[PDB]
Amino acid sequence: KELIEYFKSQMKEDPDMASAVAAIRTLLEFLKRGLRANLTSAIETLCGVDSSVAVSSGGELFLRFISKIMIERGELFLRRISLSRNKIADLCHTFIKDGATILTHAYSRVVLRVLEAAVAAKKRFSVYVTESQPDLSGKKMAKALCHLNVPVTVVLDAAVGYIMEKADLVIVGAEGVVENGGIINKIGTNQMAVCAKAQNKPFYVVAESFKFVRLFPLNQQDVPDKFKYHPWVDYTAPSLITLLFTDLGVLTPSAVSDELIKLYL
Amino acid sequence: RFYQHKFPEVEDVVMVNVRSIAEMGAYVSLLEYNNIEGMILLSELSRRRIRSINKLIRIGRNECVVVIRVDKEKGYIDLSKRRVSPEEAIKCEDKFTKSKTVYSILRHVAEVLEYTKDEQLESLFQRTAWVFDDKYKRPGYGAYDAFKHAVS
Amino acid sequence: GSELSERIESFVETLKRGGGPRSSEEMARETLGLLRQIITDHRWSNAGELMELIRREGRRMTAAQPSETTVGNMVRRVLKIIREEYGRLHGHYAQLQSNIIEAINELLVELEGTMENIAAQALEHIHSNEVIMTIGFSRTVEAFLKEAARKRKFHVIVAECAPFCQGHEMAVNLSKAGIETTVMTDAAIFAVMSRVNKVIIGTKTILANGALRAVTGTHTLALAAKHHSTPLIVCAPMFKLSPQFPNEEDSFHKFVAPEEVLPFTEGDILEKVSVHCPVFDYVPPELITLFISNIGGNAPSYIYRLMSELYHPDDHVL
Amino acid sequence: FLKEAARKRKFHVIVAECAPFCQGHEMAVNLSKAGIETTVMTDAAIFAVMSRVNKVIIGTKTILANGALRAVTGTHTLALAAKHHSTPLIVCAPMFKLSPQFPNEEDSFHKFVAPEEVLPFTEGDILEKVSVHCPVFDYVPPELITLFISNIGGNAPSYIYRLMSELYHPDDHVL
Amino acid sequence: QVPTRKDYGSKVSLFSHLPQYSRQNSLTQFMSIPSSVIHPAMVRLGLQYSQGLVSGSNARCIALLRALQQVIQDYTTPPNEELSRDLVNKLKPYMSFLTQCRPLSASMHNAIKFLNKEITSVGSSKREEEAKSELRAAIDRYVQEKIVLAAQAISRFAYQKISNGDVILVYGCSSLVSRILQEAWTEGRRFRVVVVDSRPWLEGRHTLRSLVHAGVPASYLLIPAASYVLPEVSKVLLGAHALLANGSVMSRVGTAQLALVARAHNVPVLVCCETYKFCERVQTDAFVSNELDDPDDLQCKRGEHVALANWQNHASLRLLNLVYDVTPPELVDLVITELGMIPCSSVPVVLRVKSSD
């Protein structure tokens, strides 16, 4: 159809994002064709055919955002999307202890930009990207931010259960966030979390504003199966996720439900 | 007692002690006539969204309440804060205090045959307070009732 | 009419001699009394320069004494409410300062109603012929214990923090109401913790993660209580909350002269052993149980809704 | 044990009775011929009463070869409470009834007595459609109890294998 | 207005802030037996509480609701005392009366607070009878919308949640857990529900009977052997009376230890409390505000040789039994309510977005 080629154009041409704003500006370019809402639900399904959480969640917050006028709303919504990276970057590079040993996860824009913000504030630290393999996921972060003068030593993913003695500040990337108070990411996310709660040593978590998802897991197979396609993205109860980070700012485990119920799920 | 025109006028100021708080309201005991017990009211303990119950009132202290419009069996005995926006308050506190001194010198009239039980207190008050509405200004009544006992 | 600067400087200068006054909430009393005067002759034209005046004088008042945020959350309180009232004005000039001082009157009745509220919320916890514990000294938990002393018959113990014995005084104070409390030393926080039943604590500041910041011995009391999992009720009024985090710098704690813990009667020893003590520890948010607070109870990680309301977070960084 | 302790002391014995049926109430009668202040709590209420009791003891029928016992039932939720609050556990055992039995001999380690102690014969139209089953002897995992009392002095729970090898050569444990 | 009920037997050394009763002598042994000292529906609901006749989850709320509607919709309006403010203070002997009878579920406290707030919302300026009928319309739309629309709304949402073969347990006596069970069962599903109960109520009966009459396969085990459902439970529905502002929940003696033994396996506990049950009182321990029913109902039937008949002959033996309990907010994870499936610790943020803002 017409609405997959500009979607591939925005997921490929600009590297400053995920497929989320690809879905957003794709479904805004949609409107150039009260009378469109279920057409928007059908075409957000047809663009959320990907193996991704952010595209379908952006579409459902579109149908929420509809509930001659909303063109300028959409332009300033793209303005909401644009400067969010610099706001979380200047908001989120301060809690790193000087002399602390970060353990991060596979390639997201967000921990890239926030570790670049921590370097622009010139702390002394050390980051460990982990590998997280059903495929090559961690080595691309390893090269992309050994480009910026940090000793990036990749630990084996099963070896995370021993490297946690020298990881007092474990940050993760942002793939999907849910109304329990948790975050779903690539499979090797949950195991460092359960081990970190056995370590008595904190587990910080970054996120993003319009990547908020309103479904709900409770146990193992309560993950959505249209994102799986062995697993692809896994999580469990959010008993210890220590801190979450937003366009809004510093947010506790519960408060993502507060931003959701303010906008009614 | 402190002015026998008991039920006071419409949009004036007074103060009150709060001896006990209700289940819902806070029924306060007004003191500018002997032993009635009023209430509080809902909306304006402020002018915006405060909405709380016990962080403003003690079981025991005073404050500067403002009356809106009181009648008898419409049951609107107004104890709140409306529109003290530039308005002075503590004039009524000094009115309160000087009237308490007026009581304190006259609670003990109490002559030497100890008859604390019931001497008719209006028999020594009423005739000694009766002609003292000589001018209409109620702050002028304040300075004139302060002028009452500076006896020379 | 410009005799205002001298007491800003006298106040930060008595914030540099430890910090006056002695007790806890009278600090809040004298600071909000000296905070309602910050627009006396301090005049302006538009709200923006008034905002920047509160910016500059508030940040030098907070950086003059950084080990106490009870002045910092209040200057953030006043800047928040004045931009709130200007925003409600627009949808510039006239009706501002009146409603400002009226709002200050509201909150200054609140901060003195605090200990009455925490005293009157204090019989919904305690039983007959059991024991109870608290550490340290706060007159808030003293109000809790004297209320429950007025109505029930129980059997307190107090374990005291002793770089300086700030806990013997309540330990004699609590036999005046006829409790018959027994005082051990702080060696026995675990020898008796089988035969405890409940323990209360009096915090000092609670951060914007719901993580409190208390006196010496409270971190070991929480994580030595959960080797029995008896609950920790925290005594915590709504003024001594802080929107802060553990991360801004150090001097999160407060290092004092350590002649509290060593004498000068030893011989030849003290030339090398480099002693140190804070007076304040740091406790995890996730281990305490509930508030006895001036809205009521809250869960120890609910606090973000209150800090969404009370402090406009773009000028929490100020 | 408690009768000699009340011959010379003064104490406070709450007696839960685990209740598909009663076997607490008889010592609730027989524990007042020496004035010991007994309070007969009913054992569906264990997760309230951690926050008075200091040592919570049991009586057991016999002890297995891992540090685990079989007693009258309900002792599993008793000990799984008494590890949530980390309270001690004396376990009384004279040494005729210790056993080298490891739990892999068969199932019905328990003794399924008839459910005429849980559904007597006023039930309705319901009894032949619902599954009704109770154990009389239930199993404490070896990971929780803390002290034993023997006829040779006190002993640990992670030590009893020497008492087994002293009192049984291990090859005749299947008879 | 009303006298109090005497004590019977002895008491434990701990609970002397708590009174205990008996049902062999009740309130209306003496008082004004044509009830006009107090309204008739009050002594009605009181002496049918004294034999436990309405001992339900929100059944108790609707019983006091019908009692107070028979108070209000025949209420003489006296002069010389105000239109709306002679009600609520004369209602202070009502709930103090029922507090004397057998103390309140927190559901009845929420009912008190709502009809309180609404009789303040109609003051003086309206005549008493059509104001009384507007109070009827307000209280009827309230109990209808909240109770009934919450029941079917969580039925649609938990129908989206619960799937095939989910063997789910109840500690069963309510009108919401067996409700969700039946109106999830009758839509093409399959799940083997088991009930659990406890001495001395021996109550699973309403739930298990309503399941079998709804045609659901049931099993049965009592909490004094609750370690035998220990491996095989797939999920558990916990019927809680109230739900405090810790994140805790609130129900009987027999949701005390099944909560922890089913936190000890990662089987996700699932409590069912609607928007009506979000309270504000917050307790932490288990003897603080907890009732104590008639302490000589725990006897044994061993022929006739009972141990607990003449238990006042010898010196120091006692009895007791608790009734309600509180579980900590660690264990309990998911509440079943309207706007979504909100978790434990984020409860009272919903309670502020339906509290006049």
Query: How many CA atoms within 13 Å lie on the side-chain side of E295?
Result: 24
- Using the Cβ of C168 and the Cβ atoms of chain D, whether some distance falls under 8 Å is answered with no
Nearest C-alpha neighbor of C242 from the set C209, C290, C284? C209
Nearest residue of chain C to residue A254 (CA atoms): C302
Nearest residue of chain A to residue C246 (CA atoms): A95
CATH class of the region D1-166: alpha beta
**In sequence order, what E strands does A144-243 have?**
176-178, 182-186, 233-234
A73: three-class secondary structure by DSSP:
helix
A130: three-class secondary structure by DSSP:
strand
The pair of three-digit structure tokens given for residue C88, joined into one six-digit string:
């409600």
User: Are A235 and A128 in the same domain?
Assistant: yes
Torsion of CA B48, B54, B57, B58, to 10 degrees: -160
Helices within E166-232 (DSSP H only): 177-185, 205-214
The pair of three-digit structure tokens given for residue B9, joined into one six-digit string:
């006028």
- Alpha-carbon gap, residue E127 to E77, rounded angstroms: 10
Helix then strand then coil, in percent of chain B rounded to 5, is 25, 5, 70
* Closest chain C C-alpha to B20 CA, distance in angstroms: 13
The verdict on a CB contact (< 8 Å) between A258 and E333 is no
Nearest C-alpha neighbor of C300 from the set C210, C199, C208? C210
Cα dihedral sign for E253, E258, E263, E268?
A: negative
Burial of D48 (0-12, 13-18, 19+ CB in 10 A): buried
- Alpha-carbon gap, residue A39 to A62, rounded angstroms: 12
Nearest residue of chain E to residue C126 (CA atoms): E288
Pairing of strands B62-63, B16-17: antiparallel
- Alpha-carbon gap, residue D51 to D86, rounded angstroms: 11
The pair of three-digit structure tokens given for residue B87, joined into one six-digit string:
């308005």
Q: How far apart are the first and last CA of chain E?
A: 38
Pairing of strands D137-140, E168-171: unpaired
B3: three-class secondary structure by DSSP:
coil
Q: What is the DSSP string of E99-158?
A: HHHSPPPHHHHHHHHHHHHHHHHS-SSS-HHHHHHHHHHHHHHHHIIIIIIHHHHHHHHH
Q: How far apart are the first and last CA of chain C?
A: 28
The verdict on a CB contact (< 8 Å) between C128 and E15 is yes
Q: How many CB atoms neighbour CB C124 within 10 A?
A: 13
- Alpha-carbon gap, residue C140 to C291, rounded angstroms: 13
The pair of three-digit structure tokens given for residue C136, joined into one six-digit string:
């340290």
- Alpha-carbon gap, residue E337 to C152, rounded angstroms: 39
The pair of three-digit structure tokens given for residue A136, joined into one six-digit string:
């090559």
Q: Tokens 């006992």 label which residue? A: B149
| CATH 3.40.50.970 at B12-86, yes or no | no
- Using the Cβ of C194 and the Cβ atoms of chain D, whether some distance falls under 8 Å is answered with yes
Q: Do chains B and D touch (3 or more CB pairs under 8 A)?
A: no
Q: Which residues pair with A125 in a beta bridge?
A: A100
The DSSP secondary-structure symbol of C191 reads T
Give how many domains chain A has, as a whole number. Answer: 2
- Alpha-carbon gap, residue B29 to B18, rounded angstroms: 6
Pairing of strands E249-252, E324-327: antiparallel
Tell me which chains share at least 3 CB pairs under 8 Å with chain E.
Answer: A, B, C, D
The verdict on a CB contact (< 8 Å) between C299 and E247 is yes
Nearest C-alpha neighbor of C208 from the set A93, A118, A243? A243
- Using the Cβ of C226 and the Cβ atoms of chain A, whether some distance falls under 8 Å is answered with no
Task: Say if CB E243 and CB D152 are below 8 A apart.
Answer: no
Selecting from D52, D55, D85 the residue whose C-beta is nearest the C-beta of C228 gives D85
Query: How many CA atoms within 13 Å lie on the side-chain side of E92?
Result: 9
Nearest residue of chain B to residue C104 (CA atoms): B46
- Greatest pairwise CA separation for chain E in angstroms: 69
User: Are A112 and A146 in the same domain?
Assistant: yes
Exposed e or buried b per residue across A52-90, where buried means at least 16 C-beta atoms within 10 angstroms of its C-beta: bbbbbbbbbbbeebeeeeeeeebeebeeebeebbeebbe
- Alpha-carbon gap, residue A104 to A83, rounded angstroms: 24
Boundary (domain end) residue, out of A38, A70, A87: A87
Q: D108: alpha, beta or left, given left = phi > 0 and alpha = psi -120 to 50?
A: left
- Using the Cβ of A179 and the Cβ atoms of chain E, whether some distance falls under 8 Å is answered with yes
- Using the Cβ of E121 and the Cβ atoms of chain B, whether some distance falls under 8 Å is answered with no
Burial of B62 (0-12, 13-18, 19+ CB in 10 A): middle
Which method resolved this structure? cryo-EM
Nearest C-alpha neighbor of C242 from the set C88, C72, C82? C72
- Alpha-carbon gap, residue C237 to C70, rounded angstroms: 12
Pairing of strands D69-72, D137-140: antiparallel
CATH class of the region B87-152: mainly alpha
For an interface test with C, which of B53, B55, B59 has the most C Cβ atoms less than 10 Å from its Cβ? Answer: B55
CATH superfamily assigned to domain C119-309:
Translation initiation factor eif-2b; domain 2 (3.40.50.10470)
Q: Please provide the size of chain B in residues.
A: 152
Tell me the CATH number at A17: 1.20.120.1070
Q: How many CB atoms neighbour CB C5 within 10 A?
A: 9
Selecting from A218, A237, A254 the residue whose C-beta is nearest the C-beta of E346 gives A254
Peptide bond into E93 cis (omega under 30): no
The DSSP secondary-structure symbol of E6 reads P
Task: Say if CB A187 and CB A259 are below 8 A apart.
Answer: no
CB pairs under 8 A between C and E: 56
Nearest residue of chain E to residue A219 (CA atoms): E268
Burial of B137 (0-12, 13-18, 19+ CB in 10 A): exposed
Helices within chain A (DSSP H only): 5-13, 19-29, 37-47, 54-66, 70-82, 84-91, 109-119, 139-144, 160-163, 190-199, 255-262
User: Are A178 and A63 in the same domain?
Assistant: no
Q: Which residues pair with A251 in a beta bridge?
A: A244
The domain of A103 spans 88-263
Task: Say if CB C79 and CB C37 are below 8 A apart.
Answer: no
The DSSP secondary-structure symbol of C204 reads S
Task: Say if CB E341 and CB E163 are below 8 A apart.
Answer: no
Exposed e or buried b per residue across C66-91, where buried means at least 16 C-beta atoms within 10 angstroms of its C-beta: eebbbbbbbbbbbbbbbbebbeeeee
The verdict on a CB contact (< 8 Å) between C299 and E345 is yes
Task: Say if CB E278 and CB E249 are below 8 A apart.
Answer: no
- Using the Cβ of C129 and the Cβ atoms of chain D, whether some distance falls under 8 Å is answered with no
Pairing of strands D90-92, D38-40: unpaired
The DSSP secondary-structure symbol of D38 reads E
The amino acid occupying position A163 is I
Interface of C with D in 213-232 (CB under 8 A): 227-230
Spell out where chain C is interrupted, by the residue before each break (C to N > 2.5 A): 91
What values do phi and psi take at B124, rounded to 5?
-105, -15
A170: three-class secondary structure by DSSP:
strand
Contacts of E264 in chain D (CB under 8 A): 80
- Alpha-carbon gap, residue E94 to E115, rounded angstroms: 13
- Alpha-carbon gap, residue E305 to E307, rounded angstroms: 7
Q: How far apart are the first and last CA of chain B?
A: 25
The pair of three-digit structure tokens given for residue A114, joined into one six-digit string:
């926030």
Non-local CB neighbours of E153 within 8 Å, separated by 6+ positions: E338
Task: Say if CB C212 and CB C234 are below 8 A apart.
Answer: yes
Q: What is the 3-state secondary structure (H, E, C) of D131-172?
A: EECCCCEEEECCCCCCEEEEECEEECCCCCHHHHHHHCCHHH
Separation in Å, CA E78 to CA B127, E39, E82: 38, 15, 8
Query: How many CA atoms within 13 Å lie on the side-chain side of C19?
Result: 22
Exposed e or buried b per residue across E32-64, where buried means at least 16 C-beta atoms within 10 angstroms of its C-beta: eeeeeebbebbbbbbeebbeeebbbbbbbbbbb
Task: Say if CB C236 and CB C212 are below 8 A apart.
Answer: yes
A100: three-class secondary structure by DSSP:
strand
Task: Say if CB E105 and CB E61 are below 8 A apart.
Answer: yes
Boundary (domain end) residue, out of A64, A87, A110: A87
Selecting from E244, E280, E287 the residue whose C-beta is nearest the C-beta of C127 gives E287
Q: How many CB atoms neighbour CB A185 within 10 A?
A: 24
Separation in Å, CA B12 to CA B34, B87, B92, E236: 19, 12, 10, 63
C76: three-class secondary structure by DSSP:
helix
Selecting from E244, E285, E348 the residue whose C-beta is nearest the C-beta of C231 gives E285
Residue E48 parent element (H or E):
helix E40-49
Task: Say if CB E292 and CB E323 are below 8 A apart.
Answer: yes
Helices within chain C (DSSP H only): 5-14, 25-33, 47-64, 72-90, 96-120, 139-151, 168-173, 218-225, 304-309
Nearest residue of chain C to residue A96 (CA atoms): C247
The verdict on a CB contact (< 8 Å) between A181 and E346 is yes
The DSSP secondary-structure symbol of D96 reads G
Q: Tokens 């032949």 label which residue? A: D128
Cα dihedral sign for A50, A52, A55, A60?
A: positive
- Alpha-carbon gap, residue E37 to E90, rounded angstroms: 11
Query: Resolution of the deposited coordinates, in angstroms?
Result: 4.3
The DSSP secondary-structure symbol of E237 reads E
Spell out where chain A is interrupted, by the residue before each break (C to N > 2.5 A): 33, 67, 229
Selecting from E79, E88, E125 the residue whose C-beta is nearest the C-beta of B73 gives E79
Task: Say if CB A185 and CB A176 are below 8 A apart.
Answer: yes
Peptide bond into D135 cis (omega under 30): no
The DSSP secondary-structure symbol of A203 reads B
- Using the Cβ of B54 and the Cβ atoms of chain C, whether some distance falls under 8 Å is answered with yes
- Alpha-carbon gap, residue C296 to E246, rounded angstroms: 11
B55: three-class secondary structure by DSSP:
coil
- Alpha-carbon gap, residue A9 to A15, rounded angstroms: 11
Task: Say if CB C141 and CB C235 are below 8 A apart.
Answer: yes
Non-local CB neighbours of A82 within 8 Å, separated by 6+ positions: none
The verdict on a CB contact (< 8 Å) between C194 and D88 is yes
Query: How many CA atoms within 13 Å lie on the side-chain side of E191?
Result: 29
Torsion of CA A10, A15, A20, A24, to 10 degrees: -40
A71: three-class secondary structure by DSSP:
helix
Q: What is the DSSP string of A27-49?
A: HHHGGG---SHHHHHHHHHHHTT
The amino acid occupying position E342 is I
Residue E272 parent element (H or E):
strand E269-272
Q: Do chains D and A touch (3 or more CB pairs under 8 A)?
A: no
Please give the angle made by the CA atoms of C298, C299 and C301, to the nearest 5 degrees.
Answer: 120
Separation in Å, CA C248 to CA D127, E77, E258: 67, 64, 44
- Alpha-carbon gap, residue D134 to E295, rounded angstroms: 26
Nearest C-alpha neighbor of E323 from the set E198, E146, E233? E198
The pair of three-digit structure tokens given for residue E308, joined into one six-digit string:
């607990």
Q: How many CB atoms neighbour CB E349 within 10 A?
A: 20
Task: Say if CB D109 and CB D45 are below 8 A apart.
Answer: no
Pairing of strands E318-319, D38-40: parallel
Q: Which residues pair with D71 in a beta bridge?
A: D60, D138
Please give the angle made by the CA atoms of C250, C252 and C254, to the nearest 5 degrees.
Answer: 105
For an interface test with B, which of E84, E88, E95, E115 has the most B Cβ atoms less than 10 Å from its Cβ? Answer: E88
The amino acid occupying position B89 is A
The verdict on a CB contact (< 8 Å) between E281 and C124 is yes
Q: Tokens 């002609």 label which residue? A: B131
- Alpha-carbon gap, residue E69 to E94, rounded angstroms: 13
The verdict on a CB contact (< 8 Å) between E357 and B75 is no
Cα dihedral sign for D50, D54, D60, D63?
A: positive
The verdict on a CB contact (< 8 Å) between D51 and C194 is no
Separation in Å, CA A85 to CA A248, B109, C248, E59: 12, 81, 21, 53
Task: Say if CB E91 and CB E127 are below 8 A apart.
Answer: no
Q: What is the DSSP string of C1-54?
A: --TTHHHHHHHHHHTTSS-SSSSSHHHHHHHHHTTTTTTSS---SSHHHHHHHH
Nearest C-alpha neighbor of E58 from the set E115, E100, E111? E111
Q: Tokens 């985090």 label which residue? A: C245
Q: Please provide the size of chain D in residues.
A: 175
- Alpha-carbon gap, residue B4 to B34, rounded angstroms: 10
Cα dihedral sign for A14, A15, A17, A18?
A: positive
* Closest chain E C-alpha to C139 CA, distance in angstroms: 22
Cα dihedral sign for C77, C79, C80, C86?
A: positive
Contacts of E79 in chain B (CB under 8 A): 73
- Alpha-carbon gap, residue E175 to C107, rounded angstroms: 45
The amino acid occupying position A225 is D
| Inter-helix orientation angle E205-214/E177-185, to 10° | 10
User: Are A235 and A123 in the same domain?
Assistant: yes
